[PDB]
């Protein structure tokens, strides 16, 4: 739509400017426009797409959590009926969040994943698919929640299978995937023991491969390993 008249390179340039200006909604719109040009994305471009939408959905998730907590407190025993406004506004934010998730999933399905043949690209996109289904799961209820959870699980599992066959255990995309899948198990799937096992095995297999890395690669891998350890400390 609105970015169809702008050059791909200009969209990428403006995404980078939007990032510097902390204008993440603009950044996401620019990167959506770039994806819709139909060409595969470079590593740097995949990162720009991810940063943009992560910041947009992250603000929405934070807002939804605030409103859901107010709503839950409004619905307790001996709370004053305050009318429909809290629910309405929580629903408004929820619907916007779902729309962002649907937009990202649509870009991945049309046609980023199917055109991604290298492991680094395909795993990145499958991880993203699991992440955006996970964000949908955070706000879902009931049987709808069940199917969304299964979709997140399936995307993460495909990404796991590829990453284990095609990437070293210290690869940051592989590590971040495993981190996020462990969060899925703990926070979404009610499988804390699976979460703990995955985080431990991931950490230990990365530790054993650190000796192969340059200083810069070591910094990235150890940063994610620290997040695995942080979660293990929270979970045990």
């Amino acid at each position: 739509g609105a970015m169809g008249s702008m050059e791909r390179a200009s969209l990428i340039q403006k995404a980078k400017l939007a990032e510097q200006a902390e204008r993440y909604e603009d950044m996401a719109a620019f990167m959506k426009g770039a994806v819709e040009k139909g060409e595969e994305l470079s590593c740097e471009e995949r990162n720009l797409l991810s940063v943009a939408y992560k910041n947009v959905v992250g603000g929405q998730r934070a807002a939804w959590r605030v409103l859901s907590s107010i709503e839950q407190k409004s619905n307790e025993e001996g709370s004053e009926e305050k009318g429909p406004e809290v629910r309405e506004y929580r629903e408004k934010v929820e619907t916007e969040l779902q729309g962002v998730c649907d937009t990202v999933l649509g870009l991945l399905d049309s046609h980023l994943i199917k055109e991604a043949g290298d492991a680094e690209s395909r795993v990145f996109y499958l991880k993203m698919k699991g992440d955006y289904y996970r964000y949908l799961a955070e706000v879902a209820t009931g049987d709808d929640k069940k199917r969304i959870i299964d979709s997140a699980r399936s995307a993460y599992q495909e990404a796991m299978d590829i990453s284990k066959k095609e990437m070293p255990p210290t690869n940051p995309i592989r590590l971040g995937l495993a981190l996020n899948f462990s969060v899925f198990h703990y926070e979404i799937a009610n499988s804390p023991e699976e979460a703990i096992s995955l985080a431990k095995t991931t950490f230990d297999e990365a530790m054993a491969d650190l000796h192969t890395l340059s200083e810069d690669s070591y910094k990235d891998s150890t940063l994610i390993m620290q997040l695995l350890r942080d979660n293990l400390t929270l979970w045990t």
């Binding site: 971040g176 996020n180 462990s182 969060v183 703990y186 926070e187 942080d230 929270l234 979970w235």
Partner: peptide, 8 residues
């Protein structure tokens, strides 16, 4: 809440 992968 558990920590997921941070942005760049």
């Amino acid at each position: 809440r558990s920590t997921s992968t941070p942005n760049v």
